[PDB]
Structures are given as structure tokens and as C-alpha cells.
């Protein structure tokens, strides 16, 4: 409850920025297990968890099997489609947004510190500080000092392609 | 047994000649570790951006149970060893680039610069006991690892293992480099 | 409460007419959402509950979502009742219609031309099934639909006649809400 | 420091432990028909009461009809298991706790006054001044000025009952 | 390098909230010793009133040459090991009783109490890495040694190995206890 | 963490009874090293003027990788071992003479003098655990190394291994010397 007069800025540019974004978890236990986030025209529900979406018009969608991606893609109604997560395709090396931390981009691998994301949280999008998603996390993986996220991103030709560091965790 | 909050016994006096700790402060902060043959230091070993570059020429054990009890095969075409690095020394250790500009890179025993193609340090660097040193930026970014190279008049020219402009791992070596 | 949280309360206290939305505090209809989007509401009246046939979902109240209704085709609704907590139906009965202004959820309608009437586009898609309320809290008319009337906008309602017998009051070319 | 009390009687006035050890209601279409919780790591839900537990993790427990006990027993998971309270083998003759008032042990019978209880929430356990579960209450008839209830007292040996005095109606 | 007779760098300030060091001061003063598998602590081991209770489930070496180079057979019916304790860790180490009242016993990661039959600590105790902990009195007297036991809502219920009221070495164990 | 140039925590007070540190200051400054059998000190070992005199009676390892991993044969006619000393412990370690005058020589557990032929220290010296001690001058010059010898009333007479007046390595030994 400390109220001094420092520099604000959400520390660090995720605290409202992820929270305003429409990523909706519902577990069978009524909690998070893996995040369905609306991305452009489609929502990316995790394939390898069990649960639904915190929206009646999004959880009632039938979603197609992206075993290519370890997620599921499906329709997003227009009542969500404007306020979907606008994306970006590029990924320069830099600090990006994570609601538990931050990735620093390195060697096509997005790296939160150890124990920050990966397990029980993934599908949380990775946001630009300019405010764009690069990638959707699948789970894992502990890289010791840090933790590289197994992500699903666009490439240089803008192709939605799953990345998997070896031995990654299932969500 | 008293209670100050004391800063800095050694090297934070108010008179500073300079702040050229880029060859000392980052290099000790690197995850480099000696290959001590019966305690005798015959070359340092370090994890570089992924795989570890253990000196294949140098025998002895390393200050890491994740590295010393760890069998590595032979890059005898370069006199190197690879990794096989466990995850606990992954995600930030000795990032780099493949190229080098004609600029100031470093290690433990001083800094390196050369005009065209190669690497040279001033005379008195030592190639024995130390070699196996990554060649970091003022940013802290490797370009090579020391193979030695003889003292040459004013400056010790270096042999290294390094990378191509195409990123291909190569070795730069003058005639009659120094052992490790 | 450090910025205004209504505890500084207010200078203009009730020195004039009370409100027109105190009877919308008695709005015991429910936001019938077919997949998160309100198509209509479920109107209790006399305990006998209904909702328009144009509307699917249905109901955030688990009670009213558990009662199978009966289709009234030429009233464009499906009717049933509310079991075992029935005086939640504050939405009681009007039939008497003096040509005045009766409370509706986006402002009071105008009654004239045997018709309840809001201004231009005051309705919205979702305003089907809304009750139209007396200043006694009594509910006269249940919005099936409506149609724009240039300066104002009609309301196709389920209301009653002078005998109090139900009527699908419908303007020509009315559309759902 | 949050009490704000001028001079209260120093007694556990049926909310410090009793509302803290709240026994979860059994609602059926809004109308609460009983209470139900877990004591001793085994679920109790009254057999004379239909409806739904507050907890999803308890309402998903398939229960076994103890027909000579008017309870539908099963097993809690870990999720509450430590909070499933307490008992020591005694029935001291005197006033006990109650989620509306007080009940008196008298002649192997629980004497609560009239009006208090006997309504339609019939699963509250009588609690001790030690907070120990005394008796899950299932029925009871107004014995005029006072009221005896259908309870589980377990016994002097800790062995369960359906302790129903005569004429007692399941509330 | 000066000459005071100084007391207590760390924890003898004049403000004291309490004196509940019975779970910390005696327990470190106990002759308990970690089983560190390659340095990684996977369970402590301790001499209790005679024989040592080495975790049979846990591999690694112990901080005692009188205990680590010392072969112990299998109480796999309880997942324990016995002693075989040399005399240098005999005559006072971890006295005990067989029973337990419904009262406050302890270890490293907090205190334990339970109403009837068993042992429960609050949630967050850890069963991994620590288990092999003796359960001492405020007097300092064991009643059990931790087998684990899952977090259960508010409190972590425990599995232990313990003793009968007849003194018979038994195990108390909930369904699905935690490993070590 | 402060900055004095401080002298001498322990033993440089201004009151001095004497300066008889010739049995303690030189002897610790000697290159003597314990033979610790499982850590238990059963005799010191030292390089003397060349070859090392390892106690052949005493088992265990030595605080020197140049001495402990170093196989030495048996002078069982004297119960000694020889050297085989690497050059890093050569050129000044425990110079000596062969003779002894009836004078004050020393080690760790006190000083030695005897009238005619032999060596005796006062009672309470210990022969167990320590023996393998060189017998230095106030100059710092060996004449023998302790074999033990029993407490004899007032003074502990000693057995040693020593040298002849002709320099021949011999042993002086009373009847029933002490083990090591």
C-alpha cells in the first residue's frame, strides 16, 4: 500500500496490457490450466488441457484439432473479434511482456526466468512493449537460470508455426 | 563482530583512473571455469551460448559437477570439445556474434584488437595455463576462444578458434602458435 | 474511498420528482443471452413467466432456465411460471392505459395511437422482452419488437385490451429487437 | 486491530468459530434446502435434503445412502480434508453452540428453544466451545417452548446415530 | 582485526516477538545430517536414541564418515534404514517417547499438532528434499520421523514412521503420501 | 568491513613472559604434515634435508599431493619411509646435523634435553598421535625424529630415529618405547 511518487508504467508494461487482453481460462476445476486467447480472427485454446473459455460465445465454438500446434483454433464472434489480440510477425531481441515476468528474445526462443511461466499458465500470450503478440506459449521449458517458452509464432514470411525447444512441458 | 552496512573493502575508493573493467568484471562474472590438472591451472573452460568449449588439449578436472564428470568427444580437427551442457548453465552464458570488427575484445589477461583478419594482444599475455578464454565485447559478447599464438615483438599475435562471417566455426592460427 | 465514491454524497438531494428508474430496480427480468449476447429478457408477470419466441439462450437465473415453457405462436412468446419463489415477480399488472408515459428500460415510452413509443433508435438489438412499467410499478407491455416512426420508434408489445385480454399489438412492418 | 466493541460478554458468540466453520448450504433453484459439509474427512449431506453443495468439489462427490442415518456419506478429497473438524467423546450437560442460538444437553437429548432452527436448512452441526463438531442436525419438532432435534451425538464411544426424539420432523 | 568481546551478530536484538526457537534451535543442535545426492538435498538423516534412521528411499551421501561409508540394510516394510551407529554419536542424540499427545511437536519446516491419531502441519511444508526429519518436543523429544503426506487444503497432513503406544515401530500414512 | 592496517589479533600483546617460540614458531613453519587416518591424526610426517621421513608404522594420508599419492618403500629395520621428494619441497626444508650435544632441541609438544646419549622430555608429551616429529635446534636444525618412548617418572624418555656421529642413520630406543 506504498503511495510514493515514482515513475509509473505498469512495471513492466504488462499489468494492464495483458489484463486488458481477452485471454480466457476456465478449468474443469474452475481455474487456470492453459489460456485460450483470441488472436486476430481466431482463438487458440490449448489442446493438451481440459476446460473451457470464460465467454459463452467463445466456449461454445467448435474448435479444430491443431495437433500440428498443440492448441485448438476456432471461430471468434464479432462481439469479440474487434477486441482480439492484434499480432506482430517480427521478433527483434528485446524484453517482451509476460504477466509473470518477461521474456528476452534469444535464438528463436522466448525465455522467462526460472519458475515464472511454462507450467499451469501457458497460452498466456507474449506481448510486445509496443503491444502486439509475437507468440502463444505451449508450456515449459526449464532452462536452469531461466525458462524458455515453447511458443507458436509467425515466421519471417508470416506463417503461423509452432516452435518447440526440446523436452518442453505440457502446459 | 559489529553492525555497519559497509560497502566495498577493496576497489571502490573515490579516485578512479578509469572504468575499464570490461576485461575483468564481466569475465569473472562469466561462467568460465578452470581445468586444473592436479590443481595446476592449464586452461580455463567455459560454456558459450549453448555448448561448452572444453580445451581438448588440456587435461584435468573442472569446477563444475555438471561439466567435470561429463564425457565430451573430440573436435581434434580444431582441438576443441563440445556440449552437452545441462540446463542449469543454459539461457544466458556467453552470447556472441560470428564476425569481429577491428575493435576491442578482451579476456582475463587483457584486451585484443587487430586491423584486418586476426587477433593480437600486447606482449606478456601468457598462452600457457590460461588458454581457453572467450573473447568478449564491451557489451560482453564472444567472438572467439584463445588458442595461444606467439609473442611477436611488441604485441602477442593470437591463435584462436572463432567463427566465419558465414558463422562457420573456424580457427585463426599464425605459424607456431602457443600451447595451452 | 479516496476519489469520488459517492460518500461526499451530493448537493441536489430529493427536492423534486423521485426517479424514473426506481422501477428498473424492480426489473426482475433476466438478460437472456444466447452465447453472451442479450437477445431478450424473460418477463415474469403475476408469477406467470414468459419470454419472446425470437429469443434463445437462455437465462442466467438457474430457476427460470429450468422451467419448460409453452409456445404462444400468435403472441410470439413461450409462457410458463416461476415455482416456489414467486413474489420475486414485482412486475405486476396495469391494464388501464391513460395516454401517458410509462417506464421502459431506456427511458419512458410515449403512449398514443394505441401504441407504446420511444424516440428514434432508442431501442436496440436485445430490447425484445423488455417490460414497460407504470409509475405504480405495474407492467403494461412486453416488447416483442418495434419499428422506426421517423422522429420516434414504435414498440410491438404484448399488452392487454380494455377487458384485459392479451393482444399482440404490432405496428406495420415491425422488426424484432 | 479490528473489533470495535464497547463491552461484550467474553463468549464465542456463534460467529467466531461457527461462521468460520461454515457448513455449506444445499440450494435447489435458489431455495436452500439444507446444509452439508465434511466432518472427519468424510462428506455428510442429509438424505432427506435434495439440492446442491456450495462447493463444486463436494457436489461432485458421489454419496452413499446411510438410510438409518439420514446422511449421504462419501469422501472429501485433500481440498478440505484438514478443515473437517473435530470431536472428543463427551456430551457435557449444558449449553452448546448453534448457528442461530444455543442448544442444551438434557436427558440424552438436545434442547434448543422454539423457533430457533427447524426451518429448511437442516445440515448444520452443533459445535462445541472448543469448536468440535457435536451434532449434524437433520430434523426436529417444536417441543412447545423449546425444541428437540434429530441429530448425530455420535455416542459415548464415538459411534454414529440418527438421534431422533419422537414426532421430530425433518426440517 | 580488533578486540571486542562481541555478542551475537544476527539474532539477539533487544526486540523479541517470541522465543519459539524450539523448532529451530534444538533441531539444528540435533545430530541430523543431509543425504545430499550430488549435493542436492533429498532428505535429512539423523541418529535417534540409538540406531540411525537413514531414509531408505533417498540416495546420496551423508555429512558423517561414521554414517556415509556405512552400509545399512532395508526396512522396506517401512522404507527405513537402521543402525549401526558408532559410539561417537551415542549417549545423547534424539531421545524420545513412543506415544504422542495431541500437542506441539516440530522440525525444520515448522511445528506439528493433530487432534486424534496423526500429524498435520500447515500448508507449504515441503515433503520433497526435507523428509527424514525427527519430530521433537519443546523438551526436545522425538515421536516420529516424517514420511511426507500431501498438502490438504489449509494444513499439510503428514505421513510418518512412528511408534505404537506399545512402543512398536509403526508408520502413520494417509492415502497418497508425498515422496522425499 | 573496515580499513585499518591491523597487527596481530592473538599473541602480540605488550606483556611477554618470554620468547621461547623456538619449539612452536619454527615447527609450524616447518614443512611437517599430518598422517590423518580417516582424519584422525596418528603422526606427523615431514621432509628432512632431502628425503621425507614418513612414519612406516602410521597409516593414512598426508596434507600434500606431492607426498600422499606417493609410494614409499619400507625401512622396517628402523620403521621408517624414505624419499622421493619432488623439487617443490626441496632446497630448504629441515636442515640438520648428525650429532647432538646435551642441549635443548624441541618439537610441537615441548623441548628435549638429555645428559649423555639419549633424549628425554618432561612427562605428558604424548607418543600416540604425534610421533613423526623432527627435533630442531633453536637455530632450527633437526637431530632426530621421535619414535616415542615411555613416560618415566618425572620425564618422558624418548625413542627416536637419529644419526651416528659418523652420520649413519640409527635409532635410539629405550626398552618398551611408545607407539605412534
Residue numbers in the entry:
A (entry chain F), D (entry chain I): 91 to 261
B (entry chain C), E (entry chain C), F (entry chain C): 82 to 261
C (entry chain L): 85 to 261
What does the published report state?
Here, we report a 4.4-Å cryoelectron microscopy (cryo-EM) structure of eastern equine encephalitis virus (EEEV), an alphavirus that causes fatal encephalitis in humans.
The EEEV capsid protein consists of two domains: NTD, residues 1–116, and CTD, residues 117–261. The capsid residues Lys81-Arg114 in SINV (corresponding to EEEV capsid Lys82-Lys112) have been implicated in interactions with the RNA genome. The current map of EEEV confirms that the density into which Lys82-Gly99 has been traced is indeed a part of the capsid protein. In EEEV, the residues constituting the RBS (Lys97-Asp111) form a coil and a short helix. The RBS was located on the inside of the intact NC cores. This implies that exposure of the RBS requires at least a partial dissociation of the icosahedral capsid shell. However, the icosahedrally averaged EEEV cryo-EM map shows an ordered main-chain for the capsid genome binding residues Lys82-Lys112, implying the occurrence of repetitive RNA-capsid interactions across 60 icosahedral asymmetric units.
